Design an enzyme around this catalytic site. Sequence first.
Site, PDB file in Angstrom:
ATOM      1  N   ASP A   1       0.829  -1.024   0.086  1.00 35.10           N
ATOM      2  CA  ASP A   1       0.020  -0.486  -0.148  1.00 35.10           C
ATOM      3  C   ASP A   1       1.055   1.284  -0.148  1.00 35.10           C
ATOM      4  O   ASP A   1       0.804   2.268   0.607  1.00 35.10           O
ATOM      5  CB  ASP A   1      -1.144   0.557   0.803  1.00 35.10           C
ATOM      6  CG  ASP A   1      -2.150   1.169   0.653  1.00 35.10           C
ATOM      7  OD1 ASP A   1      -2.189   1.511   0.187  1.00 35.10           O
ATOM      8  OD2 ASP A   1      -2.769   1.499   1.817  1.00 35.10           O
TER       9      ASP A   1
ATOM     10  N   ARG B   1      -0.104   8.994   1.195  1.00 38.82           N
ATOM     11  CA  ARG B   1      -0.531   8.952   2.488  1.00 38.82           C
ATOM     12  C   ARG B   1      -0.259   8.769   3.403  1.00 38.82           C
ATOM     13  O   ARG B   1      -0.772   8.400   4.856  1.00 38.82           O
ATOM     14  CB  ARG B   1      -2.597   8.441   1.990  1.00 38.82           C
ATOM     15  CG  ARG B   1      -2.216   6.923   1.126  1.00 38.82           C
ATOM     16  CD  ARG B   1      -3.719   6.695   1.569  1.00 38.82           C
ATOM     17  NE  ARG B   1      -4.109   5.039   0.442  1.00 38.82           N
ATOM     18  CZ  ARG B   1      -3.378   4.855  -0.560  1.00 38.82           C
ATOM     19  NH1 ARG B   1      -3.184   5.781  -1.369  1.00 38.82           N
ATOM     20  NH2 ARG B   1      -3.554   3.629  -1.084  1.00 38.82           N
ATOM     21  N   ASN B   2       0.888   7.461   2.813  1.00 36.00           N
ATOM     22  CA  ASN B   2       1.892   6.200   4.033  1.00 36.00           C
ATOM     23  C   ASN B   2       2.925   6.660   4.600  1.00 36.00           C
ATOM     24  O   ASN B   2       3.549   5.977   4.935  1.00 36.00           O
ATOM     25  CB  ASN B   2       1.164   4.581   3.420  1.00 36.00           C
ATOM     26  CG  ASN B   2       0.441   4.450   3.582  1.00 36.00           C
ATOM     27  OD1 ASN B   2      -0.936   5.101   4.699  1.00 36.00           O
ATOM     28  ND2 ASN B   2       0.102   3.679   3.064  1.00 36.00           N
TER      29      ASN B   2
ATOM     30  N   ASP C   1       2.158   2.456   7.806  1.00 38.79           N
ATOM     31  CA  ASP C   1       0.902   1.769   6.931  1.00 38.79           C
ATOM     32  C   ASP C   1       0.175   2.161   7.766  1.00 38.79           C
ATOM     33  O   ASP C   1       0.104   0.909   8.585  1.00 38.79           O
ATOM     34  CB  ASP C   1       1.640   0.218   6.046  1.00 38.79           C
ATOM     35  CG  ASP C   1       0.062  -0.895   5.637  1.00 38.79           C
ATOM     36  OD1 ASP C   1       0.088   0.697   5.088  1.00 38.79           O
ATOM     37  OD2 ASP C   1       0.730  -1.229   5.868  1.00 38.79           O
TER      38      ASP C   1
HETATM   39  C1  LIG Z   1       3.662   3.489  17.310  1.00 44.93           C
HETATM   40  O1  LIG Z   1       4.083   2.506  16.991  1.00 44.93           O
HETATM   41  C2  LIG Z   1       3.489   2.114  15.781  1.00 44.93           C
HETATM   42  C3  LIG Z   1       4.068   1.409  14.775  1.00 44.93           C
HETATM   43  C4  LIG Z   1       3.913   0.442  13.930  1.00 44.93           C
HETATM   44  C5  LIG Z   1       2.911   1.229  13.026  1.00 44.93           C
HETATM   45  C6  LIG Z   1       2.638   3.223  13.645  1.00 44.93           C
HETATM   46  N1  LIG Z   1       3.247   2.908  14.603  1.00 44.93           N
HETATM   47  C7  LIG Z   1       2.243   3.638  12.269  1.00 44.93           C
HETATM   48  C8  LIG Z   1       1.972   5.128  11.990  1.00 44.93           C
HETATM   49  C9  LIG Z   1       1.759   5.958  11.691  1.00 44.93           C
HETATM   50  N2  LIG Z   1       0.158   6.193  12.662  1.00 44.93           N
HETATM   51  C10 LIG Z   1      -0.065   7.193  12.775  1.00 44.93           C
HETATM   52  O2  LIG Z   1      -1.447   7.281  13.085  1.00 44.93           O
HETATM   53  C11 LIG Z   1       0.823   8.806  12.635  1.00 44.93           C
HETATM   54  C12 LIG Z   1       0.219   9.695  12.424  1.00 44.93           C
HETATM   55  C13 LIG Z   1       1.004  10.542  12.667  1.00 44.93           C
HETATM   56  C14 LIG Z   1       2.092  10.213  13.352  1.00 44.93           C
HETATM   57  N3  LIG Z   1       3.034  11.757  13.628  1.00 44.93           N
HETATM   58  N4  LIG Z   1       4.091  11.273  13.815  1.00 44.93           N
HETATM   59  C15 LIG Z   1       3.996  10.093  14.002  1.00 44.93           C
HETATM   60  C16 LIG Z   1       2.636   9.461  13.494  1.00 44.93           C
HETATM   61  C17 LIG Z   1       2.229   8.272  13.516  1.00 44.93           C
HETATM   62  C18 LIG Z   1      -0.289   4.835  12.360  1.00 44.93           C
HETATM   63  C19 LIG Z   1      -0.042   4.048  13.319  1.00 44.93           C
HETATM   64  C20 LIG Z   1       1.537   2.550  11.560  1.00 44.93           C
HETATM   65  O3  LIG Z   1       1.817   3.211  10.103  1.00 44.93           O
HETATM   66  N5  LIG Z   1       2.054   1.267  11.803  1.00 44.93           N
HETATM   67  C21 LIG Z   1       2.532   0.637  10.589  1.00 44.93           C
HETATM   68  C22 LIG Z   1       3.965   0.283   9.410  1.00 44.93           C
HETATM   69  O4  LIG Z   1       4.686   1.567   9.912  1.00 44.93           O
HETATM   70  N6  LIG Z   1       4.005  -1.338   9.529  1.00 44.93           N
HETATM   71  C23 LIG Z   1       2.912  -2.214   9.569  1.00 44.93           C
HETATM   72  C24 LIG Z   1       3.973  -3.233   8.255  1.00 44.93           C
HETATM   73  C25 LIG Z   1       5.435  -2.569   8.794  1.00 44.93           C
HETATM   74  C26 LIG Z   1       5.669  -1.343   8.852  1.00 44.93           C
HETATM   75  C27 LIG Z   1       5.514  -0.313   6.789  1.00 44.93           C
HETATM   76  F1  LIG Z   1       5.537   0.897   7.376  1.00 44.93           F
HETATM   77  F2  LIG Z   1       6.778  -0.501   6.575  1.00 44.93           F
HETATM   78  F3  LIG Z   1       4.966  -1.430   6.260  1.00 44.93           F
END
Ligand SMILES: COc1ccc2c(n1)C1(CCN(C(=O)c3ccc4[nH]ncc4c3)CC1)C(=O)N2CC(=O)N1CCC[C@H]1C(F)(F)F
Length: 293
Positions: free
Chosen positions: A146, A150-151, A164
């Site tokens: 994905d 946006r990600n 993600d």
């Molecule tokens: C705090 O701990 C975590 C742990 C994981 C994730 C997260 N937090 C967010 C981080 C952005 N998020 C905000 O809600 C968010 C929004 C605004 C922000 N500002 N600063 C930080 C932040 C985070 C969703 C959770 C996210 O996406 N994930 C998934 C993630 O990263 N993955 C899933 C598979 C492996 C990896 C990837 F990209 F490589 F694909």
Amino acid sequence: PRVDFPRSRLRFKEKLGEGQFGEVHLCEVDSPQDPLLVAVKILRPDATKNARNDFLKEVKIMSRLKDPNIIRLLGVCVQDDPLCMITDYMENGDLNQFLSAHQLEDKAAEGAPGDPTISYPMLLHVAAQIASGMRYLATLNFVHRDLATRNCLVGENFTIKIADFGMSRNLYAGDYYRVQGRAVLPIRWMAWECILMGKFTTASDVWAFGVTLWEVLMLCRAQPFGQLTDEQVIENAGEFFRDQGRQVYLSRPPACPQGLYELMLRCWSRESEQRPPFSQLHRFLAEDALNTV
Ligand SMILES: COc1ccc2c(n1)C1(CCN(C(=O)c3ccc4[nH]ncc4c3)CC1)C(=O)N2CC(=O)N1CCC[C@H]1C(F)(F)F
Ligand SMILES: [Cl-]
């Protein structure tokens, strides 16, 4: 076994997001001895056994990831409740909303600090960091599935990290094809073989990167294939499969020179093996694209 972050040191400040099994808060770390702001993901208040299982699996996945342009766990709290994952706070939020609030510069370095303008070399720099992140994931044979602006998260000094969020944010509902009332597939970012054969690979991540690069050079002003319906986007995948020259591509962005657009077109090759590797995409965005034609 890594030791838990000391949970008592977190001061919860604001809610930054909500996903399928967790929610994310901005936190202050009370005097950092191994104002410090971090992002902390915890279980949703409606968490069931299913959510906790999904959360513990994500801890395992995230433990694999150690690259400057990918989200990294700064710490965890899993030995007891409540479960927490801790990452860097990225103060400029998601890259889509970030770029949409900027306009392309007329002459290079003409504006004052703070102004909402951005240079073409900075667009290249943003894309290059995304490519470096993806190059890293490709070496772990990790398929993202994905990738899109946006990600991506934006920190200080235009640093980019791939994340993600899932398909949960109402803000981006239009970016997902829906099956049975729920988001399931980001079809406008998906390679034809993803849509038609259900095959997700590093080469389909390359296709998605091409669309993400298009997004960046459009300064996120428009959705890919934005004046076509979902059905038409799915139909287009069929024309890639049939290969009789009726497929259509995203157009060359105004801000994009022809050389860079032709590399973008290669990301959308019918044959997976002809798409460029992320190593080559990064080299072009980081160096060749600075060449004078
Ligand atoms: C705090 O701990 C975590 C742990 C994981 C994730 C997260 N937090 C967010 C981080 C952005 N998020 C905000 O809600 C968010 C929004 C605004 C922000 N500002 N600063 C930080 C932040 C985070 C969703 C959770 C996210 O996406 N994930 C998934 C993630 O990263 N993955 C899933 C598979 C492996 C990896 C990837 F990209 F490589 F694909
Ligand atoms: Cl269109």
